[PDB]
Symmetry: C3
């Protein structure tokens, strides 16, 4: 929109640049990747920053940002707030690719991978619903709670059958490392929503709320992808033999 907020603007352009750099680094890193399992995981990995760039373009252009009036009870009840709904929306595409990458690395069951992606999509769409609901504060937090439930379904797989699959696939070392990053970093998103302007609004700055999500993306997406890709490039032997 007619945005003149440098704090807000910078939080978006910064990741267009970092995501672009990521794509180049990854394409390069895959220069000598053997066909099969390795090459595939490499493909799933390149998609992460590509989707991310698309997301930040939507926000920067104003296409996926809108004004939402907060309901009675909210700290900003009666006011219109800038909602970056494009973030929720695009996650529904980026979280599934992150999970496919991990699923392949761990060589998990097809039925398990499918159930997890379904739960992840549900988590993202109910989160969008929480942000878009304007009739009553009760419904906004009800969606947030249901979204949390789907999040638990996704996490349960990472702590159970996916870890067991990685152990039999010979990738337990890298999986355990990535699992910690996923759980810790993913817990950051619902905390930002809750503390930010759309939840409790303990922090009323939209620019600050935006920078919090942008920093998380840097680690949950770009650094995560790099660590995964770097391991695969140096362990094509154990990955391909699966």
């Amino acid at each position: 929109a007619v945005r003149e907020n440098a704090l807000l603007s910078s939080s978006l352009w910064v990741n267009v640049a970092l995501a672009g750099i990521a794509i180049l680094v990854f394409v390069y890193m895959g220069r000598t990747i053997r066909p099969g399992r390795p090459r595939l995981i490499w493909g799933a990995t390149l998609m992460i920053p590509l989707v991310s760039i698309s997301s930040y373009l939507g926000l920067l252009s104003g296409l996926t940002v809108g004004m939402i009036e907060m309901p009675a009870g909210h700290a900003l009840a009666g006011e219109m707030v800038r909602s970056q709904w494009g973030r929720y929306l695009t996650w529904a595409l980026s979280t599934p690719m992150i999970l496919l990458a991990l699923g392949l690395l761990a060589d998990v069951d097809l039925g398990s991978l499918f159930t997890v992606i379904a739960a992840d999509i549900g988590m993202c769409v109910t989160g969008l619903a929480a942000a878009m609901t304007t009739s009553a504060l009760l419904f906004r937090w009800a969606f947030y709670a249901i979204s949390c439930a789907f999040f638990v379904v996704v996490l349960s797989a990472l702590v159970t059958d996916w870890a067991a699959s990685a152990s039999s696939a010979g990738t337990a070392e890298i999986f355990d490392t990535l699992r910690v990053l996923v759980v810790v970093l993913w817990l950051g998103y619902p905390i930002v929503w809750a503390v930010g302007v759309e939840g409790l609004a303990l922090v009323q700055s939209v620019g600050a709320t935006s920078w919090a999500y942008s920093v998380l993306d840097v680690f949950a997406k770009y650094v995560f992808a790099f660590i995964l890709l770097r391991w695969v490039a140096n362990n094509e032997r154990t990955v391909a033999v699966a």
Copy 2:
């Protein structure tokens, strides 16, 4: 919306309660489920009532309900009618989870499961299109007819290759029982649409139309899930050995 219709309101809250009770019953029933195939189907099953609750929250909050003006020729031509479009929309997520549960139980081909889910999604989205179309009555019913065609694609699998897979997976008894429930109960949805306010409007009450869908959901989702889960919990032997 500014709804004061108790008939309409009650048809929604009733299922928020029943769906909530279902989730608890299911989590409990899965207390002693062995890892592998069983545990997975248990996961796919818990997702059904979770998605359902999300759907009823959307309707209750007014987020996924809207006013649609009926075209010339319609029994209510020129009037604005309350459309619970959130139902169509959410089915696109709930019907696929019901099918995954059945697909696993029957241990069907990956290519078959994928084709069926695609047809199911097409059925749900063209049904939404039928409800949202306002230019001419002809187009509303054209979408309804195409939606019926996708429904036939889904059903053809249940009467052919999915039954054959269940027979070789040792789950033909439970599959045949669930198949009857699915076909009979699913035929109920297009009949309600056709007889209700959005189709022919033989019944002009939006509250009554809503209660019809709510009753179907109780059986097609909650009772269906219970029957499936109860069998799996008592036959983990034949399910896991797949």
Copy 3:
């Protein structure tokens, strides 16, 4: 809309008729298809014209067509143009079914098929974003470029691991033929977008732009499906034995 343009109208009705004829021809051609791989690919194939008909109904009814104001710099800057956004939207469902059909025929890896469909969906949604963006010309073309990148991900599979899979599946002859059709015909869509009213507008006619896409659909969907189905019906032996 209040369309009186015969050029535009005819480009839509023509394909409702051709798509309808296609469905009948295909159902018929599958009369004596043996169960298993063959029958499945037959199913994936019938879905193509079904989805296509749904798409043209959306456009004809006006449900998925809208007016978009072009930004400064555009050849039609400041004017409102008719956007057939329903095409982009529905492709997100039709391109994936075309790819499933090919994936089965070639008996490709599950992880590869999944990565490709994800990239295809990204291609379609960023293309929609390009069409819907109105704030600045820069963002419209930025989305177009990102969409092109996803297109490359999809194509890379057709020239690498999918061809290798078809060779080991004994379907390299038919795959190589279909691959040429897919690549050549798919390159046509971004060219029409670029040359048409939404891109550079070298051709400002919306009716002409619409006919270009309609002709491509005839070959990329109907003729493509026929060629694939006809081969399968005459080679059920090599297909099923997979």
